[PDB]
Design a protein around this motif. Structure first.
Motif, PDB file in Angstrom:
ATOM      1  N   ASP A   1      -7.189  -2.905  -5.929  1.00 46.69           N
ATOM      2  CA  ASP A   1      -6.353  -2.455  -7.031  1.00 46.69           C
ATOM      3  C   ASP A   1      -6.513  -0.962  -7.314  1.00 46.69           C
ATOM      4  OD1 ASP A   1      -8.662  -2.024  -8.602  1.00 46.69           O
ATOM      5  OD2 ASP A   1      -8.589  -4.071  -9.413  1.00 46.69           O
ATOM      6  N   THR A   2      -5.756  -0.473  -8.290  1.00 38.86           N
ATOM      7  CA  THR A   2      -5.773   0.946  -8.630  1.00 38.86           C
ATOM      8  C   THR A   2      -6.902   1.262  -9.610  1.00 38.86           C
ATOM      9  OG1 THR A   2      -4.123   0.610 -10.403  1.00 38.86           O
ATOM     10  CG2 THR A   2      -3.296   1.197  -8.230  1.00 38.86           C
TER      11      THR A   2
ATOM     12  N   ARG B   1      -4.411  -0.556  -1.391  1.00 43.99           N
ATOM     13  CA  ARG B   1      -3.759  -1.048  -2.592  1.00 43.99           C
ATOM     14  C   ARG B   1      -3.019  -2.325  -2.227  1.00 43.99           C
ATOM     15  NH1 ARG B   1       0.668   2.991  -4.740  1.00 43.99           N
ATOM     16  NH2 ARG B   1       1.929   1.581  -3.442  1.00 43.99           N
TER      17      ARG B   1
ATOM     18  N   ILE C   1      -1.101  -6.017  -9.425  1.00 41.99           N
ATOM     19  CA  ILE C   1      -1.721  -4.815  -8.879  1.00 41.99           C
ATOM     20  C   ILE C   1      -0.701  -3.676  -8.784  1.00 41.99           C
ATOM     21  CG2 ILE C   1      -2.721  -3.783  -6.804  1.00 41.99           C
ATOM     22  CD1 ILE C   1      -4.040  -6.600  -6.340  1.00 41.99           C
TER      23      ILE C   1
ATOM     24  N   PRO D   1       0.804  -1.229   0.000  1.00 40.17           N
ATOM     25  CA  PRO D   1       0.000   0.000   0.000  1.00 40.17           C
ATOM     26  C   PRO D   1       0.834   1.274   0.000  1.00 40.17           C
ATOM     27  CG  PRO D   1      -0.360  -1.352   2.007  1.00 40.17           C
ATOM     28  CD  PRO D   1       0.866  -1.866   1.325  1.00 40.17           C
ATOM     29  N   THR D   2       0.159   2.401  -0.188  1.00 45.27           N
ATOM     30  CA  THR D   2       0.792   3.699  -0.080  1.00 45.27           C
ATOM     31  C   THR D   2       1.248   3.893   1.353  1.00 45.27           C
ATOM     32  OG1 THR D   2      -1.355   4.721   0.364  1.00 45.27           O
ATOM     33  CG2 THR D   2      -0.577   4.739  -1.919  1.00 45.27           C
TER      34      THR D   2
END
Lengths: 411, 411
Positions: free
Chosen positions: A183-184, A236, A281, A105-106
Motif C-alpha cells: 500500500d501507499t 503498489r 489501496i 502499480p505505478t
C-alpha cells in the motif's frame, strides 16, 4: 476517494470487479466491445460504454477509447483486471497523466518488472532467490554454462559441444507463487502461496492453496523476501511473485503486477478479499490487516472451466442452452455465464472458475469432484472431463506434481 | 459403519444430505414421490425408489414404504432431514427396531422434547432458563397469573378479570437459538447462536449468525447450559435449542431434535459441516473437534427464497424457464432448483437458500443485497422483493429487531 470505476476488462474478472465495487458503494462503468453487450457485468453495471468492434485490438486494447470512457463519465479510476492492458506500462502512464487513478502499480514499476532481465536484477538486489544464470564470445559463455551447470537454456542446451545462439534449466520444478499486497502507507504483506503446476503449454488448468509440502517456516522466509522486495521497488496494489520450486529451493521467474486469475484460492484460505483490497489501496487506504492477522486455514482448489474440446482443446464457442451451476458448503462459483448466453469466439475460452474449499486438501478435492459432476453446461463442449481426470489422478491426490506432469500424463 | 443412506426427504435438504454423503463416500438412496422424479438430488442419487403418489401423507410420511426402501436396498441408515418424519418418534422407533440407524436422536429423546410440557420440565431440571410459568381452580390460577405477571398466555390474557380457559407472555423478544452437537462418546458442543427474528406467522424468512448484541461471555453461559442439557437427556446428533430473548435474558421454547433449515449460517461462521457431523455421529464417531476449537469468525446471513407472491404470499408453482444463481466471494447457494425445473404445488414453497458471509455484519448484508439483485428466477413469482425490503430496512441494519417486527413493518 474512489466514487466511480471504469472496469477495463470483460468476462468473469469484470464481474468479479463489479461485485467488489458494488460492495464498497462504488459506481461502475462497463466498457465493452460490440460483441459483449450481453455480458452479465455489462447488464449489471451503472453505466455502459461501447469502446469498439469485437476484436480485442480495437476494443479492450484501445487505449484512447478506454480513457475517453473514463473522461465522459467522470470516473476516478480504471481497473484493468488481468490480461489485456493490465501490465501495459504505456497505458498506466497514460491513465495517470490524464488524471485518473490506475488500480495497480505505478507505470515505472510495471515497466521494471515488465522486462525479464531488469526484473531479475531488481529481485536479486532485493534478496529474492533467482535462477542461477548469466546475470557472445565462445570460451566465455562456455565458462558460464559450465559454472551454471547443464542443462541450460538460451533466451535448451544439454551439452557444451552444442552451445549455440542463459540460465539454469530446471527439469522437474513445481509452479509455486506468492500473493502480495503493498500500500501507499509503506506496508507490504504476503498471503501464503498457490501451486499452479497443472498446466498445458504453460497455461494453468488447476490451481490450489496452500502449496502441498510447504511448511509455515518456509512460507515465512520466501514470503517476507517477497514483501521486502515490494517495499524496495515501491510496489503498489496486488501482485504475485511466481517461482519455479525444486528440491526445496525457490527460483524467481516473473512478477505479475496485477490481480491473477487464480486469486480466489488464496481468498478462501486467508479470508482476504483481494479485489476489495486493490480498490482500497488504490484510493490511498492502508492494507486492512497486518501480517500477523493472516493465518492459513484449510485448503482450496480452482478449476478453470473453458469452452473447449477436452482432448483436442479447440475452442467451442456457441449458445449455452442450459447452465446448471453447483453449490453447497465450500463451493464457490465465479462466472459471467448464464443460461441462454452465447460464448463468443473473439476472446479467451474461460467461462467459469469453480472454486472449492475444505478443512483439508482431501476434502477440497472431493468437493471439487462432486461439484464438477453436478455442473451442466449444455450447448457447447467444456474441459470438465479433463478436470475430472486430473482430480482422480493418484499422483495429483498425493500432491506435489511438477509443471510437466499434465502434458506427460496426457501421453 | 454407514455405507448406504436412505435420504428420507426432498428438495434442498435432500440435496444437502446427498452432497455430504458423496463427500464421505456413502452410497445414497433417494426415496421420492411420483411428483419428485425430476428433483436434482434424485437425478444425482446412486439408487432411487418411488415411495408413493404426490401427497406427502402418501409418500414422505409413508413410514412403511420408507422403511421398505431401506430394506430392499440394504441401506444402513436413514436421514430424515427436517420436517416430515424427522421429529416423529414412532418413525424413529420403527427405524431402529428394523435394524437401521436413525440419523438423529433416540426415539425416547425425540418424544421427551416432542411434548412442550415434558420438554420444559427436562430443561428446568437441566439448568436451562425457561419462561416463568405454571410449572382449573379460580383463586389458584389467579394466584399463579399474579405471581408470573401479566400479560400471560393460556396454552393471551392481559388482566385477571379476563382469566379464562399458563406462562409469561413476552411482548417484544427476539428469536435466538443455539446450535449443538452431541455424540455417543459423551461429548456435547455448542456452535454459537442464530437470530431468526424476521418471521411471518412464525415462519422464518431471514436468519443470521452470530446474533447481534450477544457477547462471547453470554454465548458461553447459555451455550454450556445447552451442552450440559444434551448430556443430561442423552442427546445424540445435531439439535437446536430455541429461545425467546428479551432484556438480556434467555427463555427456552423448543428444542428441534433434528438439523434445521438455517444451519448454513452457523457453518459459515464456525467452519463446521453440520450434516457431515450428523453422519459421523450416527456412525458412532465422536464430534470431530472440541469446544475450544470453535471460534466465531465473521458474520453470515440467509434468505429463504420461496416460490410465492412477495406481498400476497400465495404459492407460485410452475416451470422455471430461466434460473440465474449468484456467486462470487462470500456467496453460497443451497438449492435443488435448475433451469427448466417445475416447482410443484404439493410441498413447501422453498426453492433456494441464499447464504452470504462477510468479515462483518455490514458486509454480509451488502453481499446479500448484491447477490439478490443478480438472482433471476423467471417463470414464477418469488419473495426476493421482500428480502430486498428487509435488507434495506434501517432497523434491520441496526440489528436486534424483535419477532413481531416484520408483520408490524408490513403494515
Amino acid at each position: 476517494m474512489l466514487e466511480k470505476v471504469v472496469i477495463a476488462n470483460r468476462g468473469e474478472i469484470a464481474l468479479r470487479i463489479l461485485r467488489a465495487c458494488k460492495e464498497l458503494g462504488i459506481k461502475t462503468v462497463a466498457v465493452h466491445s460490440t460483441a459483449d453487450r450481453d455480458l452479465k457485468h455489462v447488464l449489471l453495471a451503472d453505466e455502459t460504454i461501447c469502446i469498439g468492434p469485437a476484436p480485442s485490438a480495437k476494443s479492450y486494447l484501445n487505449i484512447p477509447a478506454i480513457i475517453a470512457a473514463a473522461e465522459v463519465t467522470g470516473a476516478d479510476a480504471i481497473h484493468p483486471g488481468y490480461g489485456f492492458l493490465s501490465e501495459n506500462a504505456d497505458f498506466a502512464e497514460q491513465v495517470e497523466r490524464s488524471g485518473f487513478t490506475f488500480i495497480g502499480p505505478t507505470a515505472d514499476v510495471i515497466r521494471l518488472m515488465g522486462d525479464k532481465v531488469s526484473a531479475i536484477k531488481a529481485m536479486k538486489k532485493a534478496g529474492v532467490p533467482c535462477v542461477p544464470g548469466s546475470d557472445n564470445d565462445i570460451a566465455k559463455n562456455k565458462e558460464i554454462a559450465k559454472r551454471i551447470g547443464y542443462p541450460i537454456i538460451i533466451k535448451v542446451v544439454r551439452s557444451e559441444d552444442a552451445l549455440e545462439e542463459m540460465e539454469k534449466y530446471l527439469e522437474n520444478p513445481r509452479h509455486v507463487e506468492i500473493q502480495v499486497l503493498a500500500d501507499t502507507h509503506g506496508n507490504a504483506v504476503y498471503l501464503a502461496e498457490r501451486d499452479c503446476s497443472m498446466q498445458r503449454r504453460h497455461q494453468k488448468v488447476v490451481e490450489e492453496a496452500p502449496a502441498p509440502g510447504i511448511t509455515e517456516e518456509v512460507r515465512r522466509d520466501i514470503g517476507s523476501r517477497c514483501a521486502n522486495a515490494c517495499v524496495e521497488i515501491g510496489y503498489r496494489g496486488a501482485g504475485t511473485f511466481e517461482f519455479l520450486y525444486e528440491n526445496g529451493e525457490f527460483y524467481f521467474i516473473e512478477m505479475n503486477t496485477r490481480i491473477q486469475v487464480e486469486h480466489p484460492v488464496t481468498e478462501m484460505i486467508t479470508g482476504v478479499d483481494l479485489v476489495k483490497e486493490q480498490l482500497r489501496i488504490a484510493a490511498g487506504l492502508p492494507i486492512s490487516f497486518k501480517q500477523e492477522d493472516i493465518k492459513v486455514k484449510g485448503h482450496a482448489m480452482e478449476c478453470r472451466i473453458n469452452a473447449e474440446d477436452p482432448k483436442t482443446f479447440l475452442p467451442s464457442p456457441g449458445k449455452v442452452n442450459h447452465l446448471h451451476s453447483p453449490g453447497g458448503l465450500g463451493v464457490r462459483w465465479d462466472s459471467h455465464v448464464y443460461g441462454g448466453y452465447t460464448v463468443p469466439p473473439h476472446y479467451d475460452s474461460m467461462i467459469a472458475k469453480l472454486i472449492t474449499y475444505g478443512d483439508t486438501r482431501e476434502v477440497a478435492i472431493r468437493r471439487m469432484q462432486n461439484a464438477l459432476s453436478e455442473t451442466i453446461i449444455d450447448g457447447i463442449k467444456t474441459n470438465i472431463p479433463l478436470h475430472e481426470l486430473i482430480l482422480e489422478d493418484e499422483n495429483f491426490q498425493k500432491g506435489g506434481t511438477n509443471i510437466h506432469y499434465l502434458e506427460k500424463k496426457l501421453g
